[PDB]
């Protein structure tokens, strides 16, 4: 499948090389190849997958925003719309690819809380990116799909993970962004961010120096958003 | 405008 | 040819949009499409072509350098070499594409000094990028091709353009980089940069405020290199 | 290390 003939370990090694070279499209293709080998992913490998696709879709989102703004200013020839649609279609294909990997078959094989929450958070994230550009008869259903994925991830993380766990924190961070930016629920976003921050603060005393650094980094993003939102 | 999570967590 | 069905003007408009969105691969594809319409390019269009491909090959060169360094450290499995070769092959294809557009048929139709020197400078630049990764029985011939293109461009620019002309200045800048980095001729590089800088300095008095800004910007790059080289 | 020309000139 382009990558079907390459060893899993070689795909992982090349994903790490691509990251060092800031070649994120390559990195994503290598990690897609590794997933399609059908074995579960380690914690490091899950992070490589996420880094690769987050950087790819990140460029597409940034481009889409530039073009949508130009298109909106033009509405105060068809080229701006056509080109925004091209980028949008490419973004939707990347999101569909990631959602396909999660559905076939990362999530169903993920039994541990750290893997299952990571993947369900990813599912919410890539439906959220779809929701950012959605405008037709599917925007509501896309939003509901993001919410459902995030909610299942939240339920597991609250049962199975400490409040300072960085996956749990990044999940709550992104679900709060979903509430604020997608779901027109800024009060829910603010409440979630506050409660997440305060419950992690009260658990920091249990952590090593390095774990403390990991958790407080994500907590600072919650604080930055609260400052932006209030 | 709102900040979201880094890709890498743990 | 992907772009054969799109209007020339629409390709140019979309190249400008892609630039605003920092979508340089798209920008390059649009400008390649515009060139293949077979009409000569305006000054603005030549610059769009150059910006697009310079940014594309710029990312490839940066990646190739990262990977080559890793490969060299490994030589103090085949994956690092394989992946460096992949990037290298992709870079060589981009260079070959640009050289093909110049040869079919931008250069032969370019009669004015500003267009002919711009294109011949480009030809030297993309042979120089090929030379940066060349190592076999072709490195010498690639270097000679760069030198020949640069030399023809220099001869025209000295006859037809003032010493402060930004195309003439950027040409001399890049030919000096060729001498220093590719041709193992640092003295030639330093002499060329010094003479170029001093002859432009003596012509600045003829310029408008805006032209003065254009010329002194490139002159500062000559000075920065001289400071690095001496 | 050496600086080369910007893409856009004029
Ligand atoms: C969950 C356990 C874990 O994070 N394991 C691990 C080990 C080594 C490296 C990573 C890691 C996180 S992000 C990253 C990268 N951008 N290369 C690597 C994770
Ligand atoms: C040689 C004459 C010339 O430069 N004409 C011109 C007019 C308008 C805009 C440009 C130009 C130079 S770089 C650039 C871009 N990166 N879009 C546009 C040139």
Coordinates of C-alpha atoms and ligand atoms in Angstrom, one line a residue:
Chain A
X1 CA 0.0 0.0 0.0
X2 CA 3.0 2.0 -1.0
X3 CA 4.3 0.9 2.4
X4 CA 3.1 -2.7 2.5
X5 CA 6.6 -4.0 1.4
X6 CA 8.5 -2.2 4.2
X7 CA 9.2 -3.7 7.6
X8 CA 7.2 -2.3 10.5
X9 CA 10.4 -1.4 12.4
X10 CA 11.8 0.4 9.3
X11 CA 8.6 2.4 8.9
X12 CA 8.9 3.5 12.6
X13 CA 12.6 4.4 12.1
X14 CA 11.8 6.4 9.0
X15 CA 8.9 8.1 10.8
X16 CA 11.4 9.3 13.4
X17 CA 13.8 10.5 10.7
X18 CA 11.0 12.3 8.9
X19 CA 10.1 14.1 12.1
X20 CA 13.8 15.2 12.5
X21 CA 13.7 16.5 8.9
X22 CA 10.3 18.2 9.4
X23 CA 8.9 16.0 6.6
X24 CA 5.5 15.5 8.2
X25 CA 3.6 14.2 5.1
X26 CA 6.3 11.5 4.8
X27 CA 6.1 10.9 8.6
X28 CA 2.3 10.4 8.3
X29 CA 2.6 8.0 5.4
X30 CA 5.2 5.9 7.3
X31 CA 3.0 5.8 10.4
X32 CA -0.1 4.9 8.4
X33 CA 2.0 2.0 6.9
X34 CA 3.0 1.0 10.5
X35 CA -0.6 1.0 11.6
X36 CA -1.7 -1.1 8.6
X37 CA 0.7 -3.9 9.7
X38 CA -2.1 -4.7 12.1
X39 CA -0.2 -4.8 15.4
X40 CA -1.1 -2.5 18.3
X41 CA 1.0 0.6 18.8
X42 CA 3.2 1.4 21.7
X43 CA 3.0 4.7 23.6
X44 CA 5.9 6.1 21.6
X45 CA 4.3 4.9 18.3
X46 CA 0.9 6.4 19.1
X47 CA 2.6 9.7 19.7
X48 CA 4.5 9.5 16.4
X49 CA 1.2 8.9 14.6
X50 CA -0.4 11.9 16.3
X51 CA 2.5 14.2 15.7
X52 CA 2.6 13.3 12.0
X53 CA -1.1 13.8 11.3
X54 CA -1.4 16.8 13.6
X55 CA 1.3 18.6 11.7
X56 CA -0.2 17.7 8.3
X57 CA -3.7 18.7 9.1
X58 CA -2.3 21.8 10.9
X59 CA -0.9 23.2 7.7
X60 CA -4.2 22.5 5.9
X61 CA -6.2 24.2 8.6
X62 CA -3.9 27.2 8.5
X63 CA -4.2 27.4 4.7
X64 CA -8.0 26.9 4.8
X65 CA -8.3 29.8 7.3
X66 CA -6.3 32.1 5.1
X67 CA -8.4 31.2 2.0
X68 CA -11.8 31.3 3.9
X69 CA -11.0 34.8 5.1
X70 CA -10.2 35.9 1.6
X71 CA -13.3 34.3 0.3
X72 CA -15.4 36.1 3.0
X73 CA -13.9 39.4 2.1
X74 CA -14.8 38.8 -1.5
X75 CA -18.4 38.3 -0.5
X76 CA -18.8 41.7 1.3
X77 CA -14.6 34.9 -10.3
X78 CA -14.8 31.4 -8.9
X79 CA -11.1 31.0 -8.2
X80 CA -11.0 31.8 -4.5
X81 CA -13.9 29.4 -3.8
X82 CA -12.5 26.7 -6.1
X83 CA -9.1 26.8 -4.4
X84 CA -10.6 26.9 -0.8
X85 CA -12.6 23.9 -1.8
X86 CA -9.5 22.1 -3.1
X87 CA -7.7 22.6 0.2
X88 CA -10.9 21.8 2.2
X89 CA -11.3 18.5 0.2
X90 CA -7.6 17.6 0.9
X91 CA -8.1 18.3 4.6
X92 CA -11.2 16.2 4.7
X93 CA -9.3 13.3 3.1
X94 CA -6.6 13.5 5.7
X95 CA -9.2 13.5 8.5
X96 CA -11.0 10.6 6.9
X97 CA -7.7 8.7 6.6
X98 CA -7.0 9.1 10.4
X99 CA -10.6 8.2 11.3
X100 CA -10.3 5.1 9.1
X101 CA -7.2 4.0 11.0
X102 CA -8.8 4.5 14.3
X103 CA -11.9 2.5 13.2
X104 CA -9.9 -0.2 11.4
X105 CA -8.8 -1.3 13.9
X106 CA -6.9 0.8 16.5
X107 CA -9.8 1.6 18.8
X108 CA -11.4 -1.8 18.9
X109 CA -8.1 -3.4 19.9
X110 CA -7.2 -0.8 22.5
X111 CA -8.0 -2.2 25.9
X112 CA -5.7 -0.2 28.2
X113 CA -6.9 3.2 29.4
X114 CA -3.8 5.0 28.0
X115 CA -4.3 3.7 24.5
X116 CA -8.1 3.8 24.4
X117 CA -8.3 7.3 25.7
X118 CA -5.6 8.5 23.4
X119 CA -7.4 7.0 20.3
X120 CA -10.8 8.3 21.4
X121 CA -9.4 11.7 21.9
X122 CA -7.9 11.5 18.4
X123 CA -11.3 10.5 17.0
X124 CA -12.8 13.6 18.7
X125 CA -10.0 15.8 17.4
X126 CA -10.3 14.8 13.7
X127 CA -14.2 15.1 13.8
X128 CA -13.6 18.5 15.3
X129 CA -11.3 19.4 12.3
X130 CA -14.0 18.2 10.0
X131 CA -16.6 20.3 11.9
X132 CA -14.4 23.4 11.5
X133 CA -15.0 23.4 7.7
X134 CA -18.5 21.7 7.7
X135 CA -21.4 23.8 6.6
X136 CA -24.1 21.5 5.0
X137 CA -26.6 18.9 6.2
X138 CA -23.8 17.0 8.0
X139 CA -22.3 19.7 10.3
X140 CA -24.6 18.7 13.2
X141 CA -23.9 15.0 12.8
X142 CA -20.1 15.7 12.6
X143 CA -20.3 17.8 15.8
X144 CA -22.2 15.0 17.5
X145 CA -19.6 12.5 16.4
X146 CA -16.8 14.6 17.9
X147 CA -18.8 15.1 21.1
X148 CA -19.5 11.4 21.5
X149 CA -15.9 10.4 21.0
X150 CA -14.7 13.0 23.5
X151 CA -17.3 12.0 26.0
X152 CA -16.4 8.3 25.9
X153 CA -12.8 9.3 26.3
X154 CA -13.6 11.6 29.3
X155 CA -15.7 8.8 31.0
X156 CA -12.7 6.4 30.8
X157 CA -10.1 8.9 31.8
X158 CA -12.0 10.0 34.9
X159 CA -12.4 6.3 36.0
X160 CA -8.9 5.1 35.1
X161 CA -6.4 8.0 35.1
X162 CA -5.2 10.5 37.7
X163 CA -6.2 14.1 37.2
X164 CA -2.7 15.0 36.2
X165 CA -2.3 12.4 33.6
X166 CA -1.1 14.3 30.4
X167 CA -3.5 12.3 28.1
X168 CA -6.4 13.1 30.4
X169 CA -5.3 16.8 30.5
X170 CA -4.9 17.1 26.8
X171 CA -8.3 15.4 26.3
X172 CA -10.0 17.8 28.6
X173 CA -8.2 20.7 27.0
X174 CA -9.4 19.8 23.5
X175 CA -12.9 19.0 24.6
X176 CA -13.1 22.4 26.2
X177 CA -11.9 23.9 22.8
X178 CA -14.6 21.9 21.1
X179 CA -17.2 23.4 23.4
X180 CA -15.9 27.0 22.9
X181 CA -15.1 27.0 19.2
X182 CA -17.4 24.3 17.7
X183 CA -20.4 23.8 19.9
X184 CA -21.2 27.4 20.8
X185 CA -21.0 26.4 24.5
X186 CA -18.4 28.8 26.0
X187 CA -19.8 28.3 29.6
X188 CA -19.3 24.6 29.3
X189 CA -15.8 25.2 27.9
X190 CA -14.8 27.5 30.8
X191 CA -16.3 25.2 33.5
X192 CA -14.5 22.2 32.1
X193 CA -11.2 24.0 31.9
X194 CA -11.5 25.4 35.4
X195 CA -12.5 22.0 37.0
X196 CA -9.7 20.2 35.0
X197 CA -7.1 22.7 36.1
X198 CA -8.1 22.8 39.8
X199 CA -8.3 19.0 40.1
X200 CA -4.8 18.6 38.5
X201 CA -3.4 21.3 40.8
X202 CA -4.5 19.3 43.8
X203 CA -2.8 16.1 42.5
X204 CA 0.6 17.7 41.6
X205 CA 2.0 16.9 45.0
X206 CA 2.0 13.2 44.0
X207 CA 4.3 13.7 41.0
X208 CA 8.0 13.4 40.3
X209 CA 9.9 16.4 38.9
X210 CA 9.6 15.2 35.3
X211 CA 5.9 14.3 35.6
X212 CA 5.2 17.6 37.2
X213 CA 6.8 19.3 34.2
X214 CA 4.7 17.3 31.8
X215 CA 1.4 18.1 33.7
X216 CA 2.0 21.7 34.4
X217 CA 2.8 22.3 30.7
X218 CA -0.7 21.3 29.7
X219 CA -2.2 23.0 32.7
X220 CA -0.7 26.3 31.4
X221 CA -2.6 25.8 28.1
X222 CA -5.8 25.5 30.1
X223 CA -4.9 28.7 32.0
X224 CA -4.1 30.5 28.8
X225 CA -7.5 29.6 27.3
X226 CA -9.3 30.7 30.5
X227 CA -7.5 34.0 30.2
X228 CA -8.6 34.3 26.6
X229 CA -12.2 33.3 27.3
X230 CA -12.9 35.4 30.4
Chain B
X1 CA -7.4 31.5 18.8
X2 CA -7.9 28.9 21.5
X3 CA -4.9 26.6 22.4
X4 CA -5.3 22.9 21.9
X5 CA -3.2 20.0 23.1
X6 CA 0.3 19.2 21.8
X7 CA 0.3 16.0 19.6
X8 CA 2.6 14.1 21.9
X9 CA 1.4 13.3 25.4
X10 CA 2.9 11.5 28.4
Chain C
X1 CA -1.6 18.3 -17.5
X2 CA -3.5 18.4 -14.3
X3 CA -3.6 22.2 -15.1
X4 CA -4.2 22.1 -18.9
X5 CA -7.9 22.7 -18.5
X6 CA -7.5 25.9 -16.3
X7 CA -7.3 29.4 -17.7
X8 CA -3.8 31.0 -17.5
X9 CA -5.2 34.0 -15.6
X10 CA -6.9 31.6 -13.1
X11 CA -3.6 29.7 -12.6
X12 CA -1.8 33.0 -11.8
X13 CA -4.6 34.1 -9.4
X14 CA -4.4 30.7 -7.6
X15 CA -0.6 30.9 -7.5
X16 CA -1.0 34.2 -5.6
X17 CA -3.6 32.7 -3.3
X18 CA -1.3 29.7 -2.6
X19 CA 1.5 32.0 -1.7
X20 CA -0.7 33.8 0.8
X21 CA -1.7 30.4 2.3
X22 CA 2.0 29.2 2.3
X23 CA 1.0 26.3 0.1
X24 CA 4.1 26.4 -2.1
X25 CA 3.7 22.9 -3.7
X26 CA 0.4 24.1 -5.0
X27 CA 1.9 27.5 -6.0
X28 CA 4.5 25.7 -8.0
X29 CA 2.0 23.4 -9.7
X30 CA -0.1 26.5 -10.7
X31 CA 2.9 28.3 -12.1
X32 CA 4.1 25.3 -14.0
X33 CA 0.6 25.2 -15.5
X34 CA 0.9 28.8 -16.4
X35 CA 4.3 28.4 -18.1
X36 CA 3.0 25.4 -20.1
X37 CA 0.4 27.7 -21.7
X38 CA 3.3 28.8 -23.8
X39 CA 3.1 32.5 -23.5
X40 CA 6.1 34.5 -22.1
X41 CA 5.9 35.5 -18.4
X42 CA 5.7 39.0 -17.0
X43 CA 8.1 40.3 -14.4
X44 CA 5.6 39.6 -11.6
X45 CA 4.9 36.1 -13.0
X46 CA 8.6 35.2 -13.2
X47 CA 8.9 36.2 -9.6
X48 CA 5.9 34.0 -8.7
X49 CA 7.5 31.0 -10.5
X50 CA 10.8 31.6 -8.6
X51 CA 9.2 32.1 -5.2
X52 CA 7.2 28.9 -5.6
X53 CA 10.0 26.5 -6.6
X54 CA 12.5 28.2 -4.3
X55 CA 10.3 27.4 -1.4
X56 CA 9.6 23.8 -2.5
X57 CA 13.3 23.0 -3.1
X58 CA 14.2 24.9 0.0
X59 CA 12.3 22.4 2.2
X60 CA 13.8 19.5 0.3
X61 CA 17.4 20.9 0.8
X62 CA 16.8 21.5 4.5
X63 CA 15.5 17.9 4.9
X64 CA 18.3 16.5 2.8
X65 CA 20.9 18.3 5.0
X66 CA 19.3 16.9 8.2
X67 CA 19.3 13.3 6.8
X68 CA 22.8 13.5 5.3
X69 CA 24.2 14.6 8.6
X70 CA 22.5 11.7 10.3
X71 CA 23.8 9.4 7.6
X72 CA 27.4 10.7 8.1
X73 CA 27.2 10.2 11.9
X74 CA 26.1 6.6 11.2
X75 CA 29.2 6.1 9.2
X76 CA 31.8 7.2 11.9
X77 CA 20.6 -0.8 8.7
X78 CA 19.8 0.8 5.3
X79 CA 17.0 3.0 6.4
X80 CA 18.8 6.3 6.8
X81 CA 20.4 5.9 3.4
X82 CA 17.2 4.8 1.8
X83 CA 15.3 7.7 3.2
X84 CA 18.0 10.3 2.3
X85 CA 17.9 8.8 -1.2
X86 CA 14.1 9.2 -1.4
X87 CA 14.3 12.9 -0.5
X88 CA 17.3 13.4 -2.8
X89 CA 15.4 11.8 -5.7
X90 CA 12.4 14.0 -5.0
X91 CA 14.7 17.1 -4.9
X92 CA 16.3 16.1 -8.2
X93 CA 12.9 15.7 -9.8
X94 CA 11.9 19.2 -8.8
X95 CA 15.2 20.6 -10.1
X96 CA 14.7 18.7 -13.4
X97 CA 11.1 20.1 -13.7
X98 CA 12.3 23.7 -13.3
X99 CA 15.2 23.1 -15.7
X100 CA 12.7 21.6 -18.2
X101 CA 10.5 24.7 -18.1
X102 CA 13.5 26.9 -18.7
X103 CA 14.6 24.8 -21.6
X104 CA 11.1 24.3 -23.0
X105 CA 10.8 27.1 -23.8
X106 CA 11.3 30.1 -21.4
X107 CA 15.0 30.9 -22.1
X108 CA 14.8 30.6 -25.9
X109 CA 11.9 33.1 -26.0
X110 CA 13.5 35.5 -23.5
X111 CA 14.9 38.4 -25.4
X112 CA 15.0 41.2 -22.9
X113 CA 17.9 41.4 -20.5
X114 CA 15.6 41.3 -17.4
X115 CA 13.9 38.1 -18.5
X116 CA 16.9 36.4 -20.0
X117 CA 19.2 37.1 -17.0
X118 CA 16.4 36.0 -14.6
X119 CA 16.0 32.7 -16.3
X120 CA 19.7 32.0 -16.8
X121 CA 20.3 32.8 -13.1
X122 CA 17.5 30.3 -12.3
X123 CA 19.2 27.7 -14.5
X124 CA 22.4 28.2 -12.6
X125 CA 20.6 28.0 -9.3
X126 CA 18.8 24.7 -10.0
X127 CA 22.0 23.1 -11.4
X128 CA 23.7 24.4 -8.1
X129 CA 21.0 22.6 -6.1
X130 CA 21.7 19.4 -8.1
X131 CA 25.4 19.9 -7.5
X132 CA 24.8 20.1 -3.7
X133 CA 23.7 16.4 -3.7
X134 CA 25.7 15.1 -6.6
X135 CA 28.5 12.6 -5.9
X136 CA 29.0 10.3 -8.9
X137 CA 30.4 10.6 -12.4
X138 CA 28.1 13.6 -13.1
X139 CA 29.1 16.0 -10.3
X140 CA 31.7 17.7 -12.5
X141 CA 29.4 18.1 -15.4
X142 CA 26.5 19.4 -13.2
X143 CA 28.9 22.0 -11.7
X144 CA 30.0 23.0 -15.2
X145 CA 26.4 23.4 -16.2
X146 CA 25.7 25.7 -13.3
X147 CA 28.9 27.7 -14.0
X148 CA 28.0 28.1 -17.7
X149 CA 24.5 29.4 -17.0
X150 CA 25.7 31.8 -14.4
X151 CA 28.5 33.0 -16.7
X152 CA 26.2 33.7 -19.6
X153 CA 23.8 35.6 -17.2
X154 CA 26.7 37.6 -15.8
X155 CA 27.9 38.6 -19.3
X156 CA 24.4 39.9 -20.3
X157 CA 23.9 41.7 -16.9
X158 CA 27.2 43.6 -17.1
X159 CA 26.4 44.7 -20.7
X160 CA 22.7 45.5 -20.2
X161 CA 21.9 46.3 -16.6
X162 CA 23.1 48.9 -14.1
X163 CA 25.2 47.6 -11.2
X164 CA 22.4 48.2 -8.7
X165 CA 19.8 46.2 -10.7
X166 CA 18.4 43.7 -8.2
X167 CA 18.4 40.8 -10.7
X168 CA 22.1 41.6 -11.5
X169 CA 22.8 41.8 -7.7
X170 CA 21.0 38.5 -6.9
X171 CA 22.8 36.8 -9.8
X172 CA 26.2 37.9 -8.6
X173 CA 25.3 36.9 -5.0
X174 CA 24.4 33.4 -6.1
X175 CA 27.3 33.0 -8.4
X176 CA 29.6 33.9 -5.5
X177 CA 27.8 31.3 -3.3
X178 CA 28.4 28.8 -6.2
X179 CA 32.1 29.6 -6.1
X180 CA 32.4 29.3 -2.3
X181 CA 30.2 26.3 -1.6
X182 CA 30.2 24.2 -4.8
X183 CA 33.3 25.1 -6.8
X184 CA 35.9 25.2 -4.0
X185 CA 36.9 28.7 -5.1
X186 CA 36.5 30.9 -2.0
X187 CA 38.9 33.6 -3.4
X188 CA 36.7 33.9 -6.5
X189 CA 33.6 34.1 -4.3
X190 CA 35.1 36.9 -2.2
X191 CA 36.4 38.9 -5.1
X192 CA 33.1 38.7 -6.9
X193 CA 31.1 39.7 -3.8
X194 CA 33.5 42.6 -3.1
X195 CA 33.5 44.0 -6.7
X196 CA 29.7 43.6 -6.9
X197 CA 29.2 45.4 -3.7
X198 CA 31.6 48.3 -4.5
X199 CA 30.2 48.8 -8.0
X200 CA 26.6 48.9 -6.7
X201 CA 27.6 51.3 -3.8
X202 CA 28.9 53.8 -6.4
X203 CA 25.6 53.6 -8.4
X204 CA 23.2 54.1 -5.5
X205 CA 23.2 57.8 -5.9
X206 CA 21.2 57.3 -9.2
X207 CA 18.3 55.6 -7.4
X208 CA 14.9 56.5 -6.0
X209 CA 14.1 55.8 -2.4
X210 CA 12.3 52.6 -3.2
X211 CA 14.9 51.3 -5.7
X212 CA 17.6 52.2 -3.1
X213 CA 15.8 49.9 -0.6
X214 CA 15.6 47.1 -3.1
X215 CA 19.3 47.3 -4.0
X216 CA 20.7 47.8 -0.5
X217 CA 18.8 44.8 0.7
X218 CA 20.7 42.5 -1.6
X219 CA 23.9 44.4 -1.0
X220 CA 23.5 43.5 2.7
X221 CA 23.5 39.8 1.8
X222 CA 26.8 40.3 -0.1
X223 CA 28.2 42.0 3.0
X224 CA 27.0 39.3 5.4
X225 CA 28.7 36.6 3.2
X226 CA 31.9 38.6 3.1
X227 CA 31.8 38.7 6.9
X228 CA 31.2 35.0 7.1
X229 CA 34.0 34.3 4.5
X230 CA 36.7 36.5 5.9
Chain D
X1 CA 25.8 28.8 5.8
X2 CA 26.2 31.4 3.0
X3 CA 23.2 33.6 2.2
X4 CA 21.8 33.4 -1.3
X5 CA 19.3 35.7 -3.2
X6 CA 15.7 36.0 -2.3
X7 CA 13.4 34.4 -4.9
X8 CA 11.7 37.7 -5.8
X9 CA 13.8 40.4 -7.5
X10 CA 13.1 43.9 -8.8
Ligands
LIG1 C1 3.0 6.8 27.2 C2 4.3 6.5 27.3 C3 5.4 7.3 26.5 O1 5.2 8.5 26.3 N1 6.5 6.6 25.8 C4 7.5 7.4 25.0 C5 8.9 7.0 25.0 C6 9.8 7.7 24.2 C7 9.4 8.8 23.5 C8 8.0 9.1 23.5 C9 7.6 10.2 22.7 C10 6.6 11.1 23.1 S1 6.5 12.3 21.8 C11 7.7 11.7 20.8 C12 8.2 12.3 19.4 N2 7.6 13.6 18.9 N3 9.1 11.7 18.8 C13 8.2 10.6 21.5 C14 7.1 8.5 24.2
LIG2 C1 10.5 43.4 -12.8 C2 9.4 44.0 -12.5 C3 8.5 43.6 -11.2 O1 9.1 43.2 -10.3 N1 7.0 43.6 -11.3 C4 6.2 43.2 -10.2 C5 5.0 43.8 -9.9 C6 4.2 43.4 -8.8 C7 4.7 42.5 -8.0 C8 5.9 41.8 -8.2 C9 6.4 40.8 -7.3 C10 7.7 40.7 -7.0 S1 7.8 39.4 -5.8 C11 6.1 39.1 -5.8 C12 5.4 38.0 -4.9 N2 6.2 37.1 -4.0 N3 4.1 37.9 -5.0 C13 5.5 40.0 -6.6 C14 6.7 42.2 -9.3

